[PDB]
Design a protein around this ligand. Sequence first.
Ligand SMILES: *Cc1cc2c(nc3c(=O)[nH]c(=O)nc-3n2C[C@H](O)[C@H](O)[C@H](O)COP(=O)(O)OP(=O)(O)OC[C@H]2O[C@@H](n3cnc4c(N)ncnc43)[C@H](O)[C@@H]2O)c(*)c1C
Ligand SMILES: *[C@@H]1O[C@H](CO)[C@@H](O[C@@H]2O[C@H](CO)[C@@H](O)[C@H](O)[C@H]2NC(C)=O)[C@H](O)[C@H]1NC(C)=O
Ligand SMILES: *[C@@H]1O[C@H](CO)[C@@H](O)[C@H](O)[C@H]1NC(C)=O
Ligand code: NA
Length: 500
Amino acid sequence: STLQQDFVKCLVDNSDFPITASFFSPDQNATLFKEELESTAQNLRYLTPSNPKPVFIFEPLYETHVQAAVVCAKKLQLHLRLRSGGHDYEGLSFVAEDETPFVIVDLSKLRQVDVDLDSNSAWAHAGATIGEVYYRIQEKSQTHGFPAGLCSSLGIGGHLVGGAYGSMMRKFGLGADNVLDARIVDANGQILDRAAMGEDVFWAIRGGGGGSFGVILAWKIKLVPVPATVTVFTVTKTLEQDGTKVLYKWEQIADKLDDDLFIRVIISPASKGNRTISMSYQAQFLGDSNRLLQVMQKSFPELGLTKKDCTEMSWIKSVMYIAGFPNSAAPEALLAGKSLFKNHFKAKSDFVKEPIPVEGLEGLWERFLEEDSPLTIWNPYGGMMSRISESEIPFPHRNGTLFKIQWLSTWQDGKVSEERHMKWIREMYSYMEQYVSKNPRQAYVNYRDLDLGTNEGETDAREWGAKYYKGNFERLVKIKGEFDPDNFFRHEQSVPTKIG
Ligand SMILES: *Cc1cc2c(nc3c(=O)[nH]c(=O)nc-3n2C[C@H](O)[C@H](O)[C@H](O)COP(=O)(O)OP(=O)(O)OC[C@H]2O[C@@H](n3cnc4c(N)ncnc43)[C@H](O)[C@@H]2O)c(*)c1C
Ligand SMILES: *[C@@H]1O[C@H](CO)[C@@H](O[C@@H]2O[C@H](CO)[C@@H](O)[C@H](O)[C@H]2NC(C)=O)[C@H](O)[C@H]1NC(C)=O
Ligand SMILES: *[C@@H]1O[C@H](CO)[C@@H](O)[C@H](O)[C@H]1NC(C)=O
Ligand code: NA
């Protein structure tokens, strides 16, 4: 009479299928269970043996199975963690702290995507990757797209609920700025659409972050116009090529460029056996290369972009280009729904309100050259992002935001070098405090960082709540208290039911 036998009995006692082959446990098959656990889990840091493991994993095949799983987990007082794409930076979708026992409900079998051009919209289920959504859209039309993530393997279920920015945010805003409806499962196992859940809950799931406001089954997204021809480029500058001053110029102008123009910077050490710092300016321009060169000559001639560097292509090709696909790959590669690689990593995030001066940058370089594999990605805001209020949706990082920084340290060897890398990024984060947003020091919720504080820990939730959501946190808490009073949907940094 095991926990899983009770779980299955509760499942089948629901009037809505075999299910055995949708279960994974150490007792069934330890080898299979491990592989299912690791399958979509992206951060290898959270797959080491030291990490708490779920008693079992359940992969529902229909929406009714998701309902039954909620009902049964609640009835057996079994802690639930939801997983769609598995990209959580802190492994929150497959690793739970001090909630023994816990179960993973993995939604990777619900990947239906239905595109309807006539209404300029689409329904995408939680287990679909954004790459799959992108592919299905372009399949119907070369002049439609969607402004969500840059990474192809991001799961819908955990992506859009955090806001979902990408290379088209300066023109169309966030993925969460472009949704119409959704279907969610509440704490009582009811399926609610926007009409049933009400406007407050629908607001909450447009930036509130995953794991807090019920199980998202599907989003109804609003398609956006993209041109038949999109231009991209990647221009690389090192410190020996006036790199620091060039980056400083980028800080001053990137958020002020034409709405069609998105130029992010990818920054990492590079071999010159010494190292230098290398900045890759990667761009997507919703227009032709002729117009682009004119835009660049006026506002960023320091980059030294030439026609030779520009490549014109379809929107879907540009998506794969930015995502770092080889030119040898085809759009159908997006259908595999697999990440390009995996490693152990620790990430943090920042928002910049005033340009980091060159001396601040040089101090950053000194630290980067002290680390094995540091990497930082800077993403320009402005454009449409400045024209939306901070309280429109829970995502608060709008006007005044020059750009968002993603801090990264990665490694291949797990617990061998983990401690060193963790300490390095925390030191660097502390160094940067003087240069980034203050009161609060803003952070992106889909870049989970437990260092900011947890519900259970001694850090008050208002402190880290203010970083992710700013002035929207209090309202999120109120909604959470009303929607899930028993705190069934919860994790280390879930929106609490109350404050105090
Ligand atoms: C790995 C990775 C992440 C990226 C990348 N680039 C991004 C970008 O260009 N724009 C972005 O906006 N975000 C980017 N991120 C971060 C991702 O957005 C986040 O990592 C998302 O949370 C990923 O979602 P998903 O892939 O589904 O990860 P999961 O671990 O499955 O879930 C995350 C989080 O949400 C909860 N949750 C999952 N599924 C559901 C459902 N159906 N309903 C409610 N809540 C859900 C989980 O509990 C978990 O806490 C680029 C790369 C390479
Ligand atoms: C338990 O599950 C594991 C994992 O799928 C199974 O082991 C694999 O079996 C397949 C089929 O021959 C092989 O291709 C793999 O090489 C095996 N795994 C590895 C990597 O060794 C196994 O079949 C299952 N055992 C039972 C009892 O059915
Ligand atoms: C937007 O931010 C800029 C830069 O800080 C500021 O000057 C301006 O007042 C802000 N605009 C609005 C509408 O508040
Ligand atoms: Na706390």
